[PDB]
Specification:
Number of strands: 7
Helix content: 10-25%
Shape: globular
Number of helices: 2
Strand content: 35-45%
Name: BIS(5'-nucleosyl)-tetraphosphatase (Diadenosine tetraphosphatase), putative
Radius of gyration: 15 Å
Structural class: alpha+beta
Keywords: Ap4A, Nudix hydrolyse, Plasmodium, Purinergic, hydrolase
Largest sheet: 7 strands, mixed
PDB class: hydrolase
Assembly: monomeric
CATH class: Alpha Beta
Entry title: Structural and functional attributes of malaria parasite Ap4A hydrolase
């Protein structure tokens, strides 16, 4: 079972079109893989040798954002997918930025970053499981 771990990093939206109803004030960091499928995902990476150690290191390497720049919230999820018919699990840990204006620094693994919401799932061509992830995360963040 191949294991990947990432941090689902959220921030507060800088603007809301509507400030009336029950709304989604939050948005998650998504990097666009520079190769192959050009996948959009949260920052993540392969376990080596704690899943959170993995998450924090790969998030650092992938975005330049260290653990001290964000607060790990009490929510997580595991997505199971088969890679070339080999069982894989990716666990994401919700974390919110302390500074809403923290700047993403990409490595050569990605070409683009966007802060998105669960409603933008299809536009970003996210698998139903990552959309589920975003949905649940928003449920948690807005409760």
């Amino acid at each position: 079972i191949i294991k990947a771990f990432g941090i689902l990093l959220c921030r507060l939206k800088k603007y809301n079109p509507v400030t009336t109803g029950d709304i989604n004030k939050f948005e998650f960091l998504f990097l666009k893989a520079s190769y192959a499928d050009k996948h959009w995902t949260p920052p993540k990476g392969l376990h080596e040798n704690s899943g959170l150690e993995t998450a924090v290191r790969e998030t650092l390497e992938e975005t330049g954002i260290n653990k001290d720049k964000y607060k790990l919230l009490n929510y997580q999820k595991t997505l199971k997918y088969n890679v070339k018919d080999k069982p894989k699990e990716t666990t994401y840990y919700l974390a919110m930025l302390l500074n809403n204006e923290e700047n993403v620094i990409l490595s050569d693994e990605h070409t683009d970053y966007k802060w998105i919401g669960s409603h933008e799932s299809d536009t970003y061509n996210l698998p139903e499981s990552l959309a589920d992830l975003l949905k649940e995360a928003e449920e948690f963040l807005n409760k």
